[PDB]
Amino acid sequence: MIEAILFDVNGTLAETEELHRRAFNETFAALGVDWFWDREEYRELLTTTGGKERIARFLRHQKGDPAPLPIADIHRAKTERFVALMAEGEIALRPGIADLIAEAKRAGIRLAVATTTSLPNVEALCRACFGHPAREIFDVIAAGDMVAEKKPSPDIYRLALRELDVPPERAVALEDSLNGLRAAKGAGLRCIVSPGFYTRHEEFAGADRLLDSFAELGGLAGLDLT
Numbered sequence: 001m002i003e004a005i006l007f008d009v010n011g012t013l014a015e016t017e018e019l020h021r022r023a024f025n026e027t028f029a030a031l032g033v034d035w036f037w038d039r040e041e042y043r044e045l046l047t048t049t050g051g052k053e054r055i056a057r058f059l060r061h062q063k064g065d066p067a068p069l070p071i072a073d074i075h076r077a078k079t080e081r082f083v084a085l086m087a088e089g090e091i092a093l094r095p096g097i098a099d100l101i102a103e104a105k106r107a108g109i110r111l112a113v114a115t116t117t118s119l120p121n122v123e124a125l126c127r128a129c130f131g132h133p134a135r136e137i138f139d140v141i142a143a144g145d146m147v148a149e150k151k152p153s154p155d156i157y158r159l160a161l162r163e164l165d166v167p168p169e170r171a172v173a174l175e176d177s178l179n180g181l182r183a184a185k186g187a188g189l190r191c192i193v194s195p196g197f198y199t200r201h202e203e204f205a206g207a208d209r210l211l212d213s214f215a216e217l218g219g220l221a222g223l224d225l226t
């Protein structure tokens with residue numbers, strides 16, 4: 001029925017994108033460039049997953065300061081800032097997530113992360129939100145540049161499934177975004193979508209369930225869809 005649950009990270013485990021946006025903007029300020037992404041701009045840029053990819057897209061169009069460093073270096077600084085901001089301890093898990101995970105663990109169900117985000121962010125979020133290193137919560141962590149093409153490419157889900165050794169028909173993905181749903185479906189997975197601030201405007205055609213809150217699953221029971 002379900003032998004594994006695969007979780008997206010940003011927008012799914014926790015509402016994190018405003019902290020990402022802060023970490024980007026503060027990094028840009030610290031580099032002495034005039035770049036600044038407000039919510040309207042960030043909503044658009046969020047359709048490109050991966051922070052390096054997002055910076056690259058922004059730089060193709062923007063008419064402010066030229067990049068002073070390679071994008072990888074800008075993004076590495078932004079990651080360090082995000083890890084630091086996460087440690088402060090303001091971020092909570094989305095409703096239903098903590099209970100679902102604890103319930104899955106009691107039931108012996110294997111858990112993965114499949115995310116476009118940088119690996120240190122996963123670690124930082126798990127310390128802050130669960131109080132544990134990521135590998136104590138998730139049996140498999142597929143993140144960041146572990147694949148060459150990010151969501152909507154299914155590669156990150158295919159990596160996670162290969163490491164889980166669970167066929168997709170015995171697993172399910174939880175996502176918040178359209179590119180996430182596309183990726184999970186591309187790996188042959190049932191996908192439960194609950195959007196947030198930045199993704200509620202999207203069309204979720206093909207989602208197995210579209211929910212206002214992951215608490216609406218009622219835990220493990222709600223996962224085993226047709």
Ligand SMILES: O=C(COP(=O)(O)O)[C@@H](O)[C@H](O)COP(=O)(O)O
Nearest residue numbers: 008009010049050051115116117118
């Ligand atoms: O598109 C993304 C969504 O992550 P998820 O797949 O977990 O929803 C990421 O790029 C984050 O916006 C920022 O994280 P990085 O800057 O580390 O890429």
Ligand SMILES: [Mg+2]
Nearest residue numbers: 008010011176
């Ligand atoms: Mg997400």
